[PDB]
C-alpha cells in the first residue's frame, strides 16, 4: 500500500509542478505597481493603479486574502490588472535617509533663554519616552506630539535637534518643505512609511519642520 | 434589403457609447463634437438624428470605435 501512496505522491507532485509552471509562465514581467485602496467582501479588491486609473478586481489573484491590507503597494498585470505579487515596502531609501544620526549636539548649554520651553518639551517628551512606567501608573496620558509655533529665528529647529540630542532617540526628521512631491501618492507614502519606520525602531521622535508646506 | 439596412442602422446605436458635447455644426451629416475622453473629433451624423436637438451645447452620444454622432 505504501507504493500506492508513493504513486499518488508522484502524480500530485507532477500536477503541482505543471500548475506551478503555468503560474510562473503567467507571472513574467513587468508588473503595474498599484496601491490597493480597500477590500470589499461582497475576495475582491478595488485597486487604483499608478496610471491614475482604478480597476475593480472580481478575484484578488495570485495572492492570499488576509495578507492584503488597505494601502498595500502591490504589483499587478498591466492588462488584466490582477494582483500577481505583493511588493515589499522596506520604507524605500529616502525614508531611511531621514534617521540622521550625526546630530550636531545642541546641548542645553548651546541654547540660552529658552529654559522654560526646554523644560516644557522635556515634560512632554523624554520622560514620557524614558521613564514611562510611572507615566502609565499615574494615568497621565503623555501628549504624542508638540507643535513649535513662534516667530522665525526663535530656534524651533534648534531646540528640536536639542531634545533629539541629549535625550537619545533616533530623530526621524520629516521636514515639511520636503513633503511635497509632484509624483502623486509619494508624500503621503512618505509620511506613512516614516511612521511605520518609527514603529520599527527603538524609542524615537518624528520631527517635521515647517509644517505649513502641507498644513495649509 | 431596406428593412435590413434600417436594422443595421439602428444597430449602430448599440450601447457601447461615449458622450461628447456638440460644440458646433459644420454642414449636413457631420459635426465637431468633442468627446469626454479629452479630445475633439470631426465626426459624422446619423440621418435618423433630428438636427434641431443639436444645440451647440448638447451632450450627444458618440460611437465608441468610429467616433461618430449616433
Amino acid at each position: 500500500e505504501v507504493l500506492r501512496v508513493t504513486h499518488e505522491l508522484q502524480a500530485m507532485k507532477d500536477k503541482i509542478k505543471e500548475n506551478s509552471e503555468k503560474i510562473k509562465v503567467n507571472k513574467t514581467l513587468p508588473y503595474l505597481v498599484s496601491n490597493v485602496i480597500e477590500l470589499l467582501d461582497v475576495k475582491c479588491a478595488v485597486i487604483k493603479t499608478s496610471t491614475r486609473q482604478t480597476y475593480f478586481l472580481p478575484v484578488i489573484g495570485l495572492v492570499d486574502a488576509e495578507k492584503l491590507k488597505p494601502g498595500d503597494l502591490v504589483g499587478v498585470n498591466k492588462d488584466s490588472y490582477l494582483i500577481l505579487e505583493t511588493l515589499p515596502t522596506e520604507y524605500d531609501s529616502r525614508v531611511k535617509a531621514m534617521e540622521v544620526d550625526e546630530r550636531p549636539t545642541e546641548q542645553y548649554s548651546d541654547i540660552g533663554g529658552l529654559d522654560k520651553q526646554i523644560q516644557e518639551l522635556v515634560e512632554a517628551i523624554v520622560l514620557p519616552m524614558n521613564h514611562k512606567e510611572k507615566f502609565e501608573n499615574l494615568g497621565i496620558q503623555p501628549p504624542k506630539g508638540v507643535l513649535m509655533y513662534g516667530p522665525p529665528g526663535t530656534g524651533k529647529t534648534l531646540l528640536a535637534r536639542a531634545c533629539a540630542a541629549q535625550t537619545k532617540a533616533t530623530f526621524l526628521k520629516l521636514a515639511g518643505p520636503q513633503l511635497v512631491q509632484m509624483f502623486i501618492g509619494d508624500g503621503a507614502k512618505l509620511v506613512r512609511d516614516a511612521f511605520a519606520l518609527a514603529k520599527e525602531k527603538a524609542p524615537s521622535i518624528i520631527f517635521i519642520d515647517e509644517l505649513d508646506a502641507i498644513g495649509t | 434589403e431596406f428593412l435590413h439596412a434600417q436594422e443595421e442602422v439602428k444597430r449602430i446605436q448599440s450601447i457601447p457609447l461615449v458622450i461628447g458635447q456638440f460644440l458646433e455644426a459644420v454642414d449636413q451629416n457631420t459635426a465637431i463634437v468633442g468627446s469626454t475622453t479629452g479630445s475633439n473629433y470631426y465626426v459624422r451624423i446619423l440621418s435618423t438624428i433630428d438636427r434641431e436637438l443639436l444645440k451647440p451645447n448638447a451632450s450627444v452620444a458618440l460611437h465608441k470605435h468610429s467616433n461618430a454622432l449616433v
Binding site: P152, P177, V180, M182 | -
Partner: protein, 90 residues
C-alpha cells in the same frame, strides 16, 4: 525667476532642486536670484489656485538654502517672506 514658475505642478521646485544640485557639483558656484519678489512673495493660504505652486517652490528654495554663495536683489524688500529674510538664509 520666470523659468522657476512653470505651468505644471511641482516643476519649479524641481527646477530649483536641480539648480542647487548643479551648483553643488561645480566648485565655487555663485547663484544670483535677480528679482526675488517673483518667487519670494509673502506666504498666504491660496490653495484654490496656482499661487501655492510658486509658494511651494519658494519653500523648497528655503529648504535648499537652509562651497555655495547666494545672491538676491530686490527693489521692494518688504514683500519678501520674513523666513527668507531671516539671517539664516540671508
Amino acid at each position: 525667476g520666470s523659468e522657476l514658475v512653470q505651468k505644471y505642478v511641482g516643476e519649479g521646485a524641481r527646477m530649483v532642486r536641480e539648480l542647487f544640485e548643479m551648483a553643488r557639483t561645480k566648485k565655487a558656484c555663485l547663484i544670483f536670484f535677480d528679482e526675488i519678489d517673483a518667487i519670494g512673495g509673502a506666504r498666504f493660504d491660496d490653495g484654490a489656485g496656482g499661487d501655492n505652486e510658486v509658494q511651494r517652490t519658494m519653500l523648497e528654495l528655503i529648504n535648499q538654502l537652509d562651497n555655495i554663495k547666494v545672491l538676491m536683489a530686490t527693489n521692494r524688500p518688504d514683500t519678501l517672506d520674513p523666513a527668507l529674510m531671516r539671517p539664516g538664509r540671508l
